Amino acid sequence: AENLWVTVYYGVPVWKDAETTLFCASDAKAYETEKHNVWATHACVPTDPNPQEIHLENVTEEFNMWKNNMVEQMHTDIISLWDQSLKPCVKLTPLCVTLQCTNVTNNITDDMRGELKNCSFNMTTELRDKKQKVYSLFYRLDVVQINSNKEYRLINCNTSACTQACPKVSFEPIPIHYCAPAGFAILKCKDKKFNGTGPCPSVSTVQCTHGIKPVVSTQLLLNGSLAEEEVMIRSENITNNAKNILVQFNTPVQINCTRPNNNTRKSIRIGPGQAFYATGDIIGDIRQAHCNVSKATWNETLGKVVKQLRKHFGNNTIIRFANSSGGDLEVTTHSFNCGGEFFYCNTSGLFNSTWISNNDSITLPCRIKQIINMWQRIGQCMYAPPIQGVIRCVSNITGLILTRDGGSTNSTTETFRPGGGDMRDNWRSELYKYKVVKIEPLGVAPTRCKRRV
Amino acid sequence: KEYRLINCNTSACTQACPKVSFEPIPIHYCAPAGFAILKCKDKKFNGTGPCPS
Amino acid sequence: AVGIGAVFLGFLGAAGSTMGAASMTLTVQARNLLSGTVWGIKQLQARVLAVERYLRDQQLLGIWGCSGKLICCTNVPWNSSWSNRNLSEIWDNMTWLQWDKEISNYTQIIYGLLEESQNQQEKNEQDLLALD
Amino acid sequence: AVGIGAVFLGFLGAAGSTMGAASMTLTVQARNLLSGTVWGIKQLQARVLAVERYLRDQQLLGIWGCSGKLICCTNVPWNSSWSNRNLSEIWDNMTWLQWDKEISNYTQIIYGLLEESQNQQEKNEQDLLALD
Amino acid sequence: EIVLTQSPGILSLSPGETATLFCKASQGGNAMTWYQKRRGQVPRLLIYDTSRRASGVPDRFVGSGSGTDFFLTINKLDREDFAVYYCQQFEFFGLGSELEVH
Amino acid sequence: QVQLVQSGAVIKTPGSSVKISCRASGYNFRDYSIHWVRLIPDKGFEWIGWIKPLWGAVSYARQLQGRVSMTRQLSQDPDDPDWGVAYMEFSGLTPADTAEYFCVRRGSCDYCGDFPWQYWGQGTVVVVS
Amino acid sequence: QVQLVESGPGLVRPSETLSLTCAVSGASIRTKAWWSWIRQPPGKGLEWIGYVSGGWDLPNYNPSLKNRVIILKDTSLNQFSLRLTSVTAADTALYYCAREGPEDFDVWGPGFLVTVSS
Ligand SMILES: *[C@@H]1O[C@H](CO)[C@@H](O[C@@H]2O[C@H](CO)[C@@H](O[C@@H]3O[C@H](CO[C@H]4O[C@H](CO)[C@@H](O)[C@H](O)[C@@H]4O)[C@@H](O)[C@H](O[C@H]4O[C@H](CO)[C@@H](O)[C@H](O)[C@@H]4O)[C@@H]3O)[C@H](O)[C@H]2NC(C)=O)[C@H](O)[C@H]1NC(C)=O
Ligand SMILES: *[C@@H]1O[C@H](CO)[C@@H](O[C@@H]2O[C@H](CO)[C@@H](O[C@@H]3O[C@H](CO)[C@@H](O)[C@H](O)[C@@H]3O)[C@H](O)[C@H]2NC(C)=O)[C@H](O)[C@H]1NC(C)=O
Ligand SMILES: *[C@@H]1O[C@H](CO)[C@@H](O[C@@H]2O[C@H](CO)[C@@H](O[C@@H]3O[C@H](CO)[C@@H](O)[C@H](O)[C@@H]3O)[C@H](O)[C@H]2NC(C)=O)[C@H](O)[C@H]1NC(C)=O
Ligand SMILES: *[C@@H]1O[C@H](CO)[C@@H](O[C@@H]2O[C@H](CO)[C@@H](O[C@@H]3O[C@H](CO)[C@@H](O)[C@H](O)[C@@H]3O)[C@H](O)[C@H]2NC(C)=O)[C@H](O)[C@H]1NC(C)=O
Ligand SMILES: *[C@@H]1O[C@H](CO)[C@@H](O[C@@H]2O[C@H](CO)[C@@H](O)[C@H](O)[C@H]2NC(C)=O)[C@H](O)[C@H]1NC(C)=O
Ligand SMILES: *[C@@H]1O[C@H](CO)[C@@H](O)[C@H](O)[C@H]1NC(C)=O
Ligand SMILES: *[C@@H]1O[C@H](CO)[C@@H](O)[C@H](O)[C@H]1NC(C)=O
Ligand SMILES: *[C@@H]1O[C@H](CO)[C@@H](O)[C@H](O)[C@H]1NC(C)=O
């Protein structure tokens, strides 16, 4: 009996932490729409419906969303997919030209400048010999004054060429399910109260993740997965201030956003089979794009996050908010893509509050850039086509991305400012539950059996 | 006295990127699975014939 | 739980239970190891990495005593310095994760012992079938 | 040399020695057969060619008497016209290269004989387990 | 905030000896950064993560400590190592331990 | 190598402003943050603020808000994507502000945080009189 | 051109686990070679402890070493380590890492005196 032999057991359930590639999966309802008016349901496998969310019991795994993988892979996949949906579309190289711009026909005061500038310019037709004179509308944030007369040019025309987006492919998010390949499994921490780091006492394995719709937002991340009961803040280190603070709250705050300026698109032929989509007439009043939120629900959710943030900073602590301290445009405001057009909306109305230890609606004005340079590359800019009609959208605000100021010198107050920063902090708000492990079979173990000859 | 470039009536030209440099880094060649690379380690060997070592 | 009494459920379900209970459910963790214009390269390298890992495991088994027996007694003994615990305690007391944490050091010597034992059994069987 | 006495070293090390000495070292040449934006196609076709060759060899073995026994006595006899040399001389006198040069002609008939022998053994075992 | 305290202040030693510089935090459970700054020069990192050394740091520097109490041990004191030494926690700095030639 | 070249020393009148340029070279500037620190004599170090150049997101110290402003200039060309320039503008100068200012970058290792500043500029002396 | 350099203690207490580690440069570890440990008590002859191989040989030691010697190779760091559990003060010896090849132990280590003392 004490003459112990060894035995190999193949298919032993045991895993290790690993970092491998992943597996795209899209729902078949987005596959029902023909010719991919959203990106890549052909570059992504159809999701098998209701897959195996088999529970695991008496199992303690340590999760770490901050040093997590697959959020880097999601960032790389979305970047490469955004690049791969532009190579069919038309380059706007001949549009870099001297623009004769004036103000739009409007009873403008001298104080408030016109946001829209009308611009007429030469443009090549389909025929190489004949050029035409054509006009359009642009925003202040897309033209600069090259240098009596007043003549402009586009902003990107001395750093990079621009690619006009195809009006077929829309940027609205379809949900992406991530799946592990063979020999790997995705452990989902199903704990209710879980601050992103440490042992999760109630995990469950899975083959495919939930629907992760890729939204693009800097502050006030949109349509994410809200928490179960409480309002959970997450940080890599709360005492550190260089790391952001991902706030995920329970009740989603309804936001309404609209451009009320009615637009008419206009097809200008750059060349043979080259269509450019300019802005024609402003049918109706010239108004300003804006976003609304409910005053009472926003005050209530700020009370909830104050009640939760006082846990990490003591009870008798004053907590106040401020707006963004500065920088580039798309980190001061909060930016998003509503209906296939980009909004950059001011957030000073949402963060002027202080909090002591004891039917209206907030409107906030936006600005609309027609060109974008997201992810801040060296040589790419996307032109966006103007869309018809008055444009509105309703969304569920899910979480914030906050940042503590570097408070020293014995202050009771600790202020918070919304900071966008990297885009990965969006996906880290939706990949905190999951991790990827590699199954290793063929464990070995001593027992009392000897192989006979 | 007016000139042109030499290549402008046979082909277009691609300017090299000043990022990528043409200095050689050493390339090691390796066989895949199921193949092996025999190196003739003979001192005196004129390239053709039996290599005894 | 639901699988109490008739102790089975889906794969990695026994991973929380003790290794004695988990030993009866090994066919599915063996099963869910093979089956499951530039993204095709990612799909393909995932699939061939899966079959390469599976073929490496089947070749590591095949050079030992068991081709596909999935439970193999063999002829190498066990150094009691490695386990240094009560034998029947570990099948009612330990998970496979904790056991793999225990014998993390004592690895890769066992495999050479298995290869030596299998080659010795092969030469003994060759001699036995030779003199007959 | 260094591996004198305990006759082993790395793979293809026994390739110079006689086939009797090389027969004790076969596990590593079996081992070093599987493991090891347009160049990924070259890497992938190399990897799948390697696993295709390994699977063809394992299937050629599996239709014979031995799945993974790696040394297989079998039931087909040997025509002495093929070897036509002294039996114990070749295990102390010949390399595997020279032996493969010797029986280059006498190939591909042996494999059909092996398949006939294995199918005959299978139908005999089917009859034996049938009448019992 | 975090109050940091450099307890030896001025330390008077001779070359070839060993030295131990203590720092004390106001809040435990964190990392610690040790900086060397010679006279009239650029400061230079020595210890991050309370036990690790940077590039070009000789291993005679040993950072240690836990909780609120951290040590910096410099064995085999060269003449060059007589400098000011600072501790860092996330933004707050100790006022500096000055190493003096005796 | 990682190089942080500052501008030369300066003598400014009280109440005026000053702008210090920190030119970084030898790494991808769109990745690592840039911190600004000061050294006042007989006061030790004092951190000012950090700036992430990918969108220029800044954060200033609490006792210095309203008086400082940090900008950046990226490199927009596909041939030299590495170099970049941070700018710290310090306004409302007092005689207490006579000090030496530094721009710093963190290390590049795994367990390196953000505040263990590995690479340091040469320093810039600012005298108010 | 091969260069072997030992590293580890030279002064340990008896009844403990001794372990050295020899770094290898100038060549590769996975060669036709036995990376070996050989010792020598002071004033006396040599004493071959054992070896390990860069191929797939099982390591074979001197049976006088009483199965307390585990030489472990580290191909990812070009090293190979001696072990000696339950040492005595009579095990004081110069230790040597070496390389058996087609010639007999060409490149040694310098050899360091491990003086086991209590
Ligand atoms: C995000 O949203 C916030 C919230 O609105 C914006 O904050 C406001 O920004 C403006 C300017 O950017 C602030 O400035 C105000 O401008 C008004 C118009 O200026 C005219 O009048 C002044 C004389 O007062 C002239 O010098 C000037 O040339 C113009 O002719 C002023 O009327 C405002 O003065 C206020 O304060 C004085 C104090 O004495 C009062 O007497 C006035 O009656 C008046 O109340 C002021 O100068 C404005 O203060 C900001 N709002 C708030 C609530 O503070 C952000 O700008 C926006 N973000 C972005 C990027 O735009
Ligand atoms: C579109 O293309 C037309 C055709 O070239 C451009 O018109 C030309 O613009 C130049 C530059 O201003 C004019 O030259 C100047 O004209 C003025 C007025 O005649 C004259 O006083 C100056 O001495 C100088 O000659 C040129 O006449 C004009 N030609 C025509 C037919 O209008 C035009 O500028 C382009 N852009 C737009 C927005 O139309
Ligand atoms: C965050 O909120 C503060 C207010 O609490 C904003 O400060 C305000 O900033 C604007 C411009 O950024 C200042 O406007 C000034 O207007 C005159 C009018 O011509 C102009 O000449 C000046 O150059 C300046 O633009 C305004 O004075 C200032 N408010 C105060 C009280 O000083 C800050 O901009 C907000 N940040 C963001 C990102 O929205
Ligand atoms: C900061 O938060 C509050 C939103 O609750 C806003 O503060 C408002 O600031 C304006 C400044 O003109 C105040 O208007 C005037 O204030 C004087 C008192 O100084 C008052 O006597 C006048 O009748 C007039 O209302 C306004 O009262 C004040 N709001 C409150 C509730 O006191 C402000 O919108 C936020 N700041 C930013 C930059 O958004
Ligand atoms: C955002 O817009 C939606 C538009 O549907 C508003 O929802 C409606 O609000 C009215 C006013 O209370 C109700 O009578 C309707 O029943 C609501 N309809 C739906 C479908 O919800 C919403 O109130 C707006 N929110 C804010 C903050 O302005
Ligand atoms: C939020 O609601 C409470 C309760 O009425 C009120 O006391 C508080 O002032 C509100 N906050 C703001 C910013 O209006
Ligand atoms: C495994 O070996 C390491 C030395 O590399 C040792 O520190 C550790 O204690 C060993 N594990 C066990 C369970 O003893
Ligand atoms: C093999 O067959 C060829 C004819 O194809 C013959 O010339 C050769 O001699 C044969 N080999 C031997 C070893 O006899």
PDB file of N, CA and C in Angstrom, chain B residues 7-52:
ATOM      1  N   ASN B   7      13.910  58.548 -64.511  1.00  0.00           N
ATOM      2  CA  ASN B   7      12.916  57.495 -64.456  1.00  0.00           C
ATOM      3  C   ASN B   7      11.562  57.914 -64.998  1.00  0.00           C
ATOM      4  N   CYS B   8      11.383  59.182 -65.349  1.00  0.00           N
ATOM      5  CA  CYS B   8      10.053  59.716 -65.613  1.00  0.00           C
ATOM      6  C   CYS B   8       9.487  59.319 -66.960  1.00  0.00           C
ATOM      7  N   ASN B   9      10.135  58.434 -67.710  1.00  0.00           N
ATOM      8  CA  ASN B   9       9.490  57.843 -68.872  1.00  0.00           C
ATOM      9  C   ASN B   9       9.639  56.330 -68.888  1.00  0.00           C
ATOM     10  N   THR B  10       9.804  55.708 -67.727  1.00  0.00           N
ATOM     11  CA  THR B  10       9.712  54.257 -67.668  1.00  0.00           C
ATOM     12  C   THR B  10       8.847  53.784 -66.510  1.00  0.00           C
ATOM     13  N   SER B  11       8.797  54.548 -65.419  1.00  0.00           N
ATOM     14  CA  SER B  11       8.119  54.095 -64.210  1.00  0.00           C
ATOM     15  C   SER B  11       7.939  55.258 -63.254  1.00  0.00           C
ATOM     16  N   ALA B  12       6.978  55.112 -62.355  1.00  0.00           N
ATOM     17  CA  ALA B  12       6.922  56.002 -61.213  1.00  0.00           C
ATOM     18  C   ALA B  12       7.953  55.570 -60.180  1.00  0.00           C
ATOM     19  N   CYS B  13       8.260  56.472 -59.262  1.00  0.00           N
ATOM     20  CA  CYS B  13       9.262  56.216 -58.242  1.00  0.00           C
ATOM     21  C   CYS B  13       8.623  56.328 -56.872  1.00  0.00           C
ATOM     22  N   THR B  14       9.080  55.501 -55.947  1.00  0.00           N
ATOM     23  CA  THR B  14       8.614  55.533 -54.573  1.00  0.00           C
ATOM     24  C   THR B  14       9.745  56.035 -53.699  1.00  0.00           C
ATOM     25  N   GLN B  15       9.521  57.153 -53.027  1.00  0.00           N
ATOM     26  CA  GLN B  15      10.502  57.657 -52.085  1.00  0.00           C
ATOM     27  C   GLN B  15      10.517  56.760 -50.866  1.00  0.00           C
ATOM     28  N   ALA B  16      11.711  56.400 -50.411  1.00  0.00           N
ATOM     29  CA  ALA B  16      11.814  55.564 -49.229  1.00  0.00           C
ATOM     30  C   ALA B  16      11.434  56.356 -47.989  1.00  0.00           C
ATOM     31  N   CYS B  17      10.794  55.682 -47.055  1.00  0.00           N
ATOM     32  CA  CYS B  17      10.473  56.329 -45.794  1.00  0.00           C
ATOM     33  C   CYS B  17      11.747  56.498 -44.978  1.00  0.00           C
ATOM     34  N   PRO B  18      12.013  57.688 -44.439  1.00  0.00           N
ATOM     35  CA  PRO B  18      13.190  57.860 -43.577  1.00  0.00           C
ATOM     36  C   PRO B  18      13.087  57.141 -42.240  1.00  0.00           C
ATOM     37  N   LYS B  19      11.913  56.621 -41.876  1.00  0.00           N
ATOM     38  CA  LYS B  19      11.808  55.735 -40.722  1.00  0.00           C
ATOM     39  C   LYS B  19      12.595  54.455 -40.946  1.00  0.00           C
ATOM     40  N   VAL B  20      12.194  53.676 -41.948  1.00  0.00           N
ATOM     41  CA  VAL B  20      12.792  52.369 -42.171  1.00  0.00           C
ATOM     42  C   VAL B  20      14.185  52.544 -42.755  1.00  0.00           C
ATOM     43  N   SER B  21      15.170  51.939 -42.101  1.00  0.00           N
ATOM     44  CA  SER B  21      16.555  51.997 -42.530  1.00  0.00           C
ATOM     45  C   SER B  21      16.945  50.681 -43.181  1.00  0.00           C
ATOM     46  N   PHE B  22      17.903  50.756 -44.093  1.00  0.00           N
ATOM     47  CA  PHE B  22      18.310  49.607 -44.882  1.00  0.00           C
ATOM     48  C   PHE B  22      19.501  48.875 -44.300  1.00  0.00           C
ATOM     49  N   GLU B  23      19.926  49.218 -43.089  1.00  0.00           N
ATOM     50  CA  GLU B  23      21.054  48.522 -42.498  1.00  0.00           C
ATOM     51  C   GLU B  23      20.647  47.091 -42.151  1.00  0.00           C
ATOM     52  N   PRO B  24      21.507  46.114 -42.421  1.00  0.00           N
ATOM     53  CA  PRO B  24      21.106  44.715 -42.252  1.00  0.00           C
ATOM     54  C   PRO B  24      21.105  44.300 -40.789  1.00  0.00           C
ATOM     55  N   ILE B  25      19.988  43.738 -40.348  1.00  0.00           N
ATOM     56  CA  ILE B  25      19.950  43.028 -39.077  1.00  0.00           C
ATOM     57  C   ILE B  25      20.156  41.563 -39.432  1.00  0.00           C
ATOM     58  N   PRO B  26      20.799  40.766 -38.585  1.00  0.00           N
ATOM     59  CA  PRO B  26      21.079  39.378 -38.961  1.00  0.00           C
ATOM     60  C   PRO B  26      19.814  38.540 -38.990  1.00  0.00           C
ATOM     61  N   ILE B  27      19.658  37.786 -40.069  1.00  0.00           N
ATOM     62  CA  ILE B  27      18.543  36.868 -40.236  1.00  0.00           C
ATOM     63  C   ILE B  27      19.031  35.465 -39.922  1.00  0.00           C
ATOM     64  N   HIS B  28      18.375  34.805 -38.978  1.00  0.00           N
ATOM     65  CA  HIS B  28      18.563  33.387 -38.754  1.00  0.00           C
ATOM     66  C   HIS B  28      17.464  32.643 -39.492  1.00  0.00           C
ATOM     67  N   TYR B  29      17.856  31.672 -40.300  1.00  0.00           N
ATOM     68  CA  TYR B  29      16.902  30.791 -40.947  1.00  0.00           C
ATOM     69  C   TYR B  29      16.718  29.546 -40.104  1.00  0.00           C
ATOM     70  N   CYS B  30      15.478  29.096 -39.990  1.00  0.00           N
ATOM     71  CA  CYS B  30      15.160  27.924 -39.201  1.00  0.00           C
ATOM     72  C   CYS B  30      14.260  27.003 -40.003  1.00  0.00           C
ATOM     73  N   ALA B  31      14.419  25.720 -39.773  1.00  0.00           N
ATOM     74  CA  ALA B  31      13.552  24.733 -40.383  1.00  0.00           C
ATOM     75  C   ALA B  31      12.259  24.608 -39.585  1.00  0.00           C
ATOM     76  N   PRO B  32      11.159  24.231 -40.230  1.00  0.00           N
ATOM     77  CA  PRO B  32       9.937  23.947 -39.474  1.00  0.00           C
ATOM     78  C   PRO B  32       9.960  22.549 -38.891  1.00  0.00           C
ATOM     79  N   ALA B  33       8.832  22.098 -38.355  1.00  0.00           N
ATOM     80  CA  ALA B  33       8.762  20.757 -37.798  1.00  0.00           C
ATOM     81  C   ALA B  33       8.833  19.723 -38.911  1.00  0.00           C
ATOM     82  N   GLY B  34       9.541  18.630 -38.648  1.00  0.00           N
ATOM     83  CA  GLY B  34       9.723  17.606 -39.649  1.00  0.00           C
ATOM     84  C   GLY B  34      10.845  17.855 -40.627  1.00  0.00           C
ATOM     85  N   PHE B  35      11.675  18.863 -40.391  1.00  0.00           N
ATOM     86  CA  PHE B  35      12.823  19.143 -41.237  1.00  0.00           C
ATOM     87  C   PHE B  35      13.978  19.571 -40.352  1.00  0.00           C
ATOM     88  N   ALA B  36      15.195  19.346 -40.832  1.00  0.00           N
ATOM     89  CA  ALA B  36      16.375  19.718 -40.067  1.00  0.00           C
ATOM     90  C   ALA B  36      17.423  20.288 -41.003  1.00  0.00           C
ATOM     91  N   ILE B  37      18.242  21.200 -40.491  1.00  0.00           N
ATOM     92  CA  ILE B  37      19.238  21.858 -41.317  1.00  0.00           C
ATOM     93  C   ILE B  37      20.595  21.261 -40.991  1.00  0.00           C
ATOM     94  N   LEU B  38      21.196  20.591 -41.960  1.00  0.00           N
ATOM     95  CA  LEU B  38      22.521  20.024 -41.780  1.00  0.00           C
ATOM     96  C   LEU B  38      23.564  21.060 -42.157  1.00  0.00           C
ATOM     97  N   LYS B  39      24.444  21.376 -41.214  1.00  0.00           N
ATOM     98  CA  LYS B  39      25.536  22.310 -41.423  1.00  0.00           C
ATOM     99  C   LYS B  39      26.817  21.512 -41.579  1.00  0.00           C
ATOM    100  N   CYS B  40      27.448  21.631 -42.739  1.00  0.00           N
ATOM    101  CA  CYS B  40      28.756  21.031 -42.950  1.00  0.00           C
ATOM    102  C   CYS B  40      29.793  21.839 -42.189  1.00  0.00           C
ATOM    103  N   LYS B  41      30.305  21.277 -41.099  1.00  0.00           N
ATOM    104  CA  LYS B  41      31.261  21.965 -40.247  1.00  0.00           C
ATOM    105  C   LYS B  41      32.702  21.676 -40.640  1.00  0.00           C
ATOM    106  N   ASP B  42      32.934  21.211 -41.863  1.00  0.00           N
ATOM    107  CA  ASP B  42      34.290  20.924 -42.301  1.00  0.00           C
ATOM    108  C   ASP B  42      35.072  22.215 -42.483  1.00  0.00           C
ATOM    109  N   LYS B  43      36.329  22.192 -42.045  1.00  0.00           N
ATOM    110  CA  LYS B  43      37.213  23.337 -42.225  1.00  0.00           C
ATOM    111  C   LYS B  43      37.519  23.561 -43.701  1.00  0.00           C
ATOM    112  N   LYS B  44      38.113  22.566 -44.349  1.00  0.00           N
ATOM    113  CA  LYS B  44      38.445  22.650 -45.766  1.00  0.00           C
ATOM    114  C   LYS B  44      37.327  21.988 -46.559  1.00  0.00           C
ATOM    115  N   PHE B  45      36.555  22.795 -47.280  1.00  0.00           N
ATOM    116  CA  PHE B  45      35.389  22.284 -47.992  1.00  0.00           C
ATOM    117  C   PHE B  45      35.073  23.229 -49.140  1.00  0.00           C
ATOM    118  N   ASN B  46      35.143  22.721 -50.367  1.00  0.00           N
ATOM    119  CA  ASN B  46      34.981  23.540 -51.556  1.00  0.00           C
ATOM    120  C   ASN B  46      33.554  23.561 -52.084  1.00  0.00           C
ATOM    121  N   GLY B  47      32.559  23.349 -51.229  1.00  0.00           N
ATOM    122  CA  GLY B  47      31.187  23.601 -51.581  1.00  0.00           C
ATOM    123  C   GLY B  47      30.461  22.424 -52.198  1.00  0.00           C
ATOM    124  N   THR B  48      31.191  21.463 -52.753  1.00  0.00           N
ATOM    125  CA  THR B  48      30.568  20.365 -53.473  1.00  0.00           C
ATOM    126  C   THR B  48      31.223  19.058 -53.065  1.00  0.00           C
ATOM    127  N   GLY B  49      30.405  18.058 -52.761  1.00  0.00           N
ATOM    128  CA  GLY B  49      30.908  16.733 -52.487  1.00  0.00           C
ATOM    129  C   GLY B  49      30.609  16.264 -51.082  1.00  0.00           C
ATOM    130  N   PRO B  50      31.249  15.172 -50.662  1.00  0.00           N
ATOM    131  CA  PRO B  50      30.987  14.630 -49.324  1.00  0.00           C
ATOM    132  C   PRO B  50      31.659  15.469 -48.247  1.00  0.00           C
ATOM    133  N   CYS B  51      30.878  15.858 -47.247  1.00  0.00           N
ATOM    134  CA  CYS B  51      31.406  16.556 -46.090  1.00  0.00           C
ATOM    135  C   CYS B  51      31.505  15.564 -44.945  1.00  0.00           C
ATOM    136  N   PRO B  52      32.706  15.214 -44.481  1.00  0.00           N
ATOM    137  CA  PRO B  52      32.832  14.123 -43.508  1.00  0.00           C
ATOM    138  C   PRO B  52      32.442  14.495 -42.092  1.00  0.00           C
TER     139      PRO B  52
END
